[PDB]
Structures are given as structure tokens and as C-alpha cells.
Amino acid sequence: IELKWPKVPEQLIKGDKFLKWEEGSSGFIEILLRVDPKGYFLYWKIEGKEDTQLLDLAYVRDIRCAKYAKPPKDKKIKEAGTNFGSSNIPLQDKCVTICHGYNYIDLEWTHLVAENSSVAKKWSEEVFSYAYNLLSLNKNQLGEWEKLYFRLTTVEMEKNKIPVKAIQKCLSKDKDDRARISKALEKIGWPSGKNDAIDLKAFDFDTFFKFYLALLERSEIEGIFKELSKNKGNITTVMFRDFLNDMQRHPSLHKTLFPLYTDAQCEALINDYESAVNKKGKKKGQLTKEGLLYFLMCEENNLTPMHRLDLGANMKLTLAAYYINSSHNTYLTGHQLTGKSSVEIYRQVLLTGCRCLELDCWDGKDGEPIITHGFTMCTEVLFKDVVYAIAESAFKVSDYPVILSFENHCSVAQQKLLAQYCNEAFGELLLDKPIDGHPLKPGVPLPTPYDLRKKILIKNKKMHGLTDEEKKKIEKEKKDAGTAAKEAEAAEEMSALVNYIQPVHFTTFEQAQKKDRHYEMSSMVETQALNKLKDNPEDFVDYNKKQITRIYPKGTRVDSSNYVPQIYWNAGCQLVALNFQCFDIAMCVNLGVFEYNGCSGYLLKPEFMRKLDKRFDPFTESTVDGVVAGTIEIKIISAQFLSDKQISSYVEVEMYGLPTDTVRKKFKTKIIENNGMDPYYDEKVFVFKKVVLPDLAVVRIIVSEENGKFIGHRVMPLDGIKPGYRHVPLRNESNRPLGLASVFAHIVAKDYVSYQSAQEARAAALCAFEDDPDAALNAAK
């Protein structure tokens, strides 16, 4: 595994001097900016401010320097910045710009001037790597506890002392919870008064874990300890080994590729945990209740399968073999008809690892092409600005190829400019010619993502007996397509940039097979794709083994709502385009699944979906030959640190995959009232008895306030899911960590131990994906 934890240079730990300034103010202040030794926070002090200022790198989106930074325009700031460090270094070369946000639509900005260009560059490269570190983003609850520990001992520390005030503010705003915190500090033997402070010497991490033990009532651990110890006293080495190999391990996990734990390893692990919790009170090969809880929260018990998180997939198959992270009308940051267009949104979408973007190009009044949603009240942006934005951000988080979907409405003169600016903005990144071994002839497969690393592909038109019932459906498809229904003819300069991703008019699956052109593809509005899926589902899957389908939402979704992408991934569609600005279930799931494989934006389709000789109906309700069906059981036990106030909460568990495996609005826990710190649900297990196609499915935990307000979630693909007792750190809608907020659950995952037309039956099957499946099903009949 190539993934590494953040490694923070001593230079950044000590810190560097910067001038900090804000838009809309003429002020500036020199700060000493620092990173904690674990790469979790940027922090700095402002003279006269009580609290140390910080940025939680969990929500940092980008950091830019030099030509990509935003230099100050205010006269007084510019003069100060020019004089800061060396005046012989141009102002902009010293500038560093940071953008941060809980989600990527609502950004805030921090602007800095370094003393020189080397410092600006070093900080930009280092901080970006920490913000996008997959291990840091996936750490278990003990890791999040350690993050809090490092905040307290670096950011909040005052003259080698940790103020109690700082401990309380980091955990809760509630009076009762603050009392619990004080009592817990008292129980440990630390000062607990409102205005007291703890010495750094006495504030070690292992004692900080003893504070965790004193604070939360993890009532469930007693019964679980009794279970695993067989009620015989402490958990012995052999009992722990069997726990790890039987309960915490998928029974079908390959025993050579993923070796079983041994006695010697388990004795050693027990020593690790017992050392941390009991020190010389530890007994050889004997794990205590507190030692068990430590394990359950530590990296050894991380729910995330590291071999899947790492960029470990085979990237050397045809492009058609992958699910590719895709954005629709990417320029829009809100409503389809009344919202704003943006340049920065392109950078933000690419930073999630999204690989396929859309650019709706129109003639600008001044002779310069623009991007906007035609015939609406949306604002416009310059095409040139967008492509320079794409060129900046395209390969910052993924090396794998980007596809730009052009919806081209420009005159020939402005299309010349589109082509010109693509060339000038992208340079070498632009794939303007076929590569060796892959000419554009029939029968020649598409290149692999590996072949096309660091390349931008252009999807644009190249140079130029139906029945009445069929013609009417086609008319509806065209209407639902909106502005995409009619583009301009391709100019030769734009045509010239198109090769492997050539959009063509779809006729039939029979015709696509006959032509045998792997570089021809179709971009279908959801209405068209649904007609094909319902008419010829098996043929759709077969088409997608060699050729690419892009899907995009119909025009009636004016609020930028999304379909659930599994609907189309189930048919092997590769470019399932979503509105990234709408954080509905579809986007939550999309960002969840594409975190895996190194956040590359590419996921390899299941083998059965790539086998040319296999026929597969995604509407099947029975087991598929060659694919082992699964059973999943999820028991929601408790949650930790859901909120800084006393909230009432519940937990839901959903599954999305094949229609027959998709379960929404079925499973909901009881409400635990007035407890945001350690609610204990102890809910009866939720059973997903028969999962027909596990590798197309994900299970999802969603935590909400009683009034339905979203708190956090976690998406767990069944491919590689780890069973047993797991802490599940929660994520926000953009799939960034909430922090300490976690659900504790038990997971069973094992092999399953045993209408008037097809179209109508298939439409009914698709009701399972809706926000209210029963109501959708009732409305159809």
C-alpha cells in the first residue's frame, strides 16, 4: 500500500511569517503560521485575540500560490506585501490563497503573503497533501481523539499549559455536558475548575484516553466484553485471535492474500493495547474491557479496507470497463434557471476527483465565447476563464484522464476561439490525436485510463421506418434534453480535437454492434436511457462492455435534483452525470463510492459486467450465475459526539444497488432524546436478507436529528466491507469528516445461505430508488 500518514517538516511545525489580509478591508497583520505535528490544523495567533485562530484541514479545499493565487488589489496591502521579505521578488510570486468550506459550494478564503516564492510553494504543496491525505480522512475514532489531543496541546496550549476552558469549548456548548467534562477531569486527577489549566507534563495521550473512559458511558462494552471473553474473565490471546478471525473478518475473505491473525501477533497486539490502558498493570495475553474499547477505536479496527482505499485497481483495461466520476452542467452552482454560473466550481469539482465535466458554450456579445445555461436567467462566465481553471485543477488529486463534455452552440468564429483557448490553456494535456496501438478503426478497443494519464479528452460533435408510438417517445426524449437537443454543427478546429469520445446519434443496439466502433459513444438524457433500459436491459449492459454511455438529468429537474446513479451503473453506464451543487442522496452516494481507488475518479466495473460472453439483466430478482449472493445485517448500537449541544437523534440504514437490492425508508432506530454526546440506541438488528449482487451495492448509515435535520452519514460498499463491531466515523454531504462524530455498530456480512408488460414491471422496480418508494409505486398503477 502506497498510502502514507502526513509527514510535517520541522519548518512548518516551527512556522513561517506571513502577512494576512482580507477582501473588503485595507488592514493587514503579520502572523506566524504553523502546522501541528500530525498535519491536522493550520494555526496562528492574532495579538489581542483570546482564542488562537485555526483552520481544520479536514475542510481545506485548495491552497494555491504564485500565478494561481489571488494577489491583493488594495494599495496599502499591495505596498506592504511588496515590502514583505524581499521586494525584489514579485508580489504575486509570494502570494498564497487558501479556500476552505464544510461543503465545496459555500467557500471561505484566507489570503497570505510569504517572505519569498520558495516558502509560498513549500506551504502550498505540503498543506494540499495534508488536506487530501486519505489515511487522515479515514482515521478511526481513536485517531480523531488524538487529533483533539493535538489541538489541545498545540493550538490551545498557553505557556506549556492546557486551559480547562479550551477542553470544554472543543467538546460542548451545553451546560450539562460541560459539567460532565469537569467531573471526568476530576475523576482522572486533573484540575477541573472553570479557570484552571493542566500542565503539559501531566497531559499525556494515554491519560487523555483515560479521560475518554471517564467521560463517555459506553454501556454496550460490558455485554460485548462478556460475549468475547465467554464470561471466563479477561479476553485471552486465543479468544482475541478467534474474535479477529471469525467475527471481525468476512468468512469468504481469501486466507492467503489476507492472512489470518496468529497467536504471536495477537499476544503482541494485546500488549500494545494493555500498555496504553493499564501500563505495568497489564497481564501477558490478557485483554481487559478498556483494552478492548481501545482496540475497537484504533486503526487496527478501521472499517475502511485499505487495499480498496489505495489506488490498487487494475487501470489497464479499456475505458468502457470503468465507472467514471461525472458532473452535469458543471458551471451551475445552484438552480438550473435562476442560479449563477461559476469558474471556481470547475476547480472544486475536479478537486473531488470528478473526471468528466460539462461546458455549455454559447456566443458572447463581445465576440468571445461564454458558458451558461441557454435561454434562462443564469449568469454567464468566459469560456477562456473556465479552461484555464480546468488546466490548473485537472490533475491535482487524480492522475487519470479527464473528459470534457462540450454542448456546443457557438458560431464558427467563436468555435475557432474555443479550440484556440483549449490549445493554449491545456497544452500537452490535450489529447488532440489518437495514440499508438489505438487507431480509430472498427474493432479497436478504447485506450486504458493508464494509457491516458494526465490527458484531457474532448467530447464534441465531429464534422458532419419508426412507428408513430416510437416517434412520440423520441420527441419527449428531445424535449427533456433541453438545450442539449440541438447543438451547432462542428467547426473543423473543434472536430479536430475529438477522437476516442465521439458523440453520435443513438439508433439501436444492433446497429452499434454492427458498426463495431468503440470510439463512438452516446450521451443520453435520463428519459432516453430509461427507455433503453426498460426495452432492452441485457443489450444495454452488452453495449457498455465496449462503448461508453453518458447519462444526464432531464430538463424538468430545474432545482438541480439528481437521480440515484446506481440506476445507470447497474446497466454498466460509465459517465453517470450528477449535479454536484445538489447535496441530495445521489451526490452523497457518489462522493462516498468514488473516495475509493485513491480518489482517482475511476472504479473498475465488476468482472461479470465486463465478460463479453455473459448476458445480465439488471432487473433480475434471482441469484446471478457466477456471482455469490450476500446477506448483510446492521445493528446500530450507539453513537458518540454527534453534537456540541443536547440533541435528539436517530439512525437510518439504507441500501442502493440493483433494484431488487435497493432498500429505502425501511430501517430507523428509536430516538434518543437530549443526548448529543453518547446516545445508546441498542436497536434490534436491521436485516438485508438476500443481496443478489453485492458488488453493485452499498450500505449507508444516516444520522439525523429528530426533526429530520441531517447530521452525518457513511457509505460502505459491500465489495470489501469489513464485518463485526465497528466504529463508523461520520461524514458530511461532501464526504469530509465531521471529526469525532461516530456510530458504533455490529455488521454481519457473509454469503447468502439459501404486470401487463416487461416495461411496466421494470418501471415499477425503479420505484425502489425514490425518496418515497411506496408512494412512487402507488402513483404508477
Which residues are identified as catalytic? 328, 373
Where does this chain touch Ca ion (CB under 5 A) — which range of 98-106, 203-211, 240-248, 356-364? 356-364
CA dist 91 and 87 (Å) reads: 8
CA dist 342 and 474 (Å) reads: 32
Contacts with Ca ion in 88-117 (CB under 5 A)? none
CA dist 136 and 143 (Å) reads: 8
Angle at 289 between CA 288 and CA 293, to 5 degrees: 115
Where does this chain touch Ca ion (CB under 5 A) — which range of 202-210, 223-231, 400-408, 739-747? 400-408
**Smaller CB separation from Ca ion, 329 or 579:** 329
CA dist 666 and 684 (Å) reads: 13
Window 586-625: contact mask with Ca ion (x via CB under 5 A): ----------------------------------------
Nearest approach in angstroms of CB 531 to Ca ion is 20
**Smaller CB separation from Ca ion, 329 or 398:** 329
* Residue 526 found at the interface with Ca ion (CB under 5 A): no
CA dist 628 and 753 (Å) reads: 10
**Smaller CB separation from Ca ion, 278 or 483:** 483
Strands (E) in 221-299, as ranges, are: 235-236, 286-287
Q: Which amino acid is at 610?
A: R
Q: At what angle do helices 526-535 and 758-765 cross, to 10 degrees?
A: 130
Run of H or E residues at 141: helix 141-150
Nearest approach in angstroms of CB 483 to Ca ion is 6
**Smaller CB separation from Ca ion, 31 or 484:** 484
In our burial notation (b when 16+ CB lie closer than 10 A, e otherwise), range 44-56 reads: beeeeeeebebbb
**Smaller CB separation from Ca ion, 481 or 738:** 481
Nearest approach in angstroms of CB 360 to Ca ion is 4
Among 144, 156, 344, 360, binds Ca ion (CB under 5 A): 360
Window 279-318: contact mask with Ca ion (x via CB under 5 A): ----------------------------------------
CB 503 within 8 A of CB 459: yes
Nearest approach in angstroms of CB 575 to Ca ion is 13
* Residue 407 found at the interface with Ca ion (CB under 5 A): yes
Where does this chain touch Ca ion (CB under 5 A) — which range of 261-269, 355-363, 569-577, 727-735? 355-363
**Smaller CB separation from Ca ion, 153 or 329:** 329
| Three-state DSSP class for residue 720 | coil
Q: At what angle do helices 289-297 and 141-150 cross, to 10 degrees?
A: 90
Where does this chain touch Ca ion (CB under 5 A) — which range of 197-205, 301-309, 323-331, 531-539? 323-331
Number of residues engaging Ca ion in binding (CB under 5 A): 3
**Smaller CB separation from Ca ion, 145 or 552:** 552
Nearest approach in angstroms of CB 332 to Ca ion is 9
CB 743 within 8 A of CB 639: yes
Nearest approach in angstroms of CB 589 to Ca ion is 22
Window 325-354: contact mask with Ca ion (x via CB under 5 A): ----x-------------------------
Strands (E) in 526-585, as ranges, are: 549-552, 575-576
* Residue 16 found at the interface with Ca ion (CB under 5 A): no
CA atoms within 13 A on the CB side of 283: 9
Contacts with Ca ion in 738-757 (CB under 5 A)? none
**Smaller CB separation from Ca ion, 36 or 526:** 526
Closest CA to 501 of 555, 539, 455: 455
Where does this chain touch Ca ion (CB under 5 A) — which range of 187-195, 270-278, 407-415, 485-493? 407-415
| Three-state DSSP class for residue 698 | strand
Terminal alpha carbon distance of the chain: 52
CA dist 548 and 573 (Å) reads: 7
The alpha carbons of the chain give a radius of gyration, in whole angstroms, of 28
Window 542-561: contact mask with Ca ion (x via CB under 5 A): --------------------
Nearest approach in angstroms of CB 550 to Ca ion is 11
Q: Which amino acid is at 429?
A: L
Run of H or E residues at 480: helix 468-481
Question: Where do contacts with Ca ion occur on this chain (CB under 5 A)?
Answer: 329, 360, 407
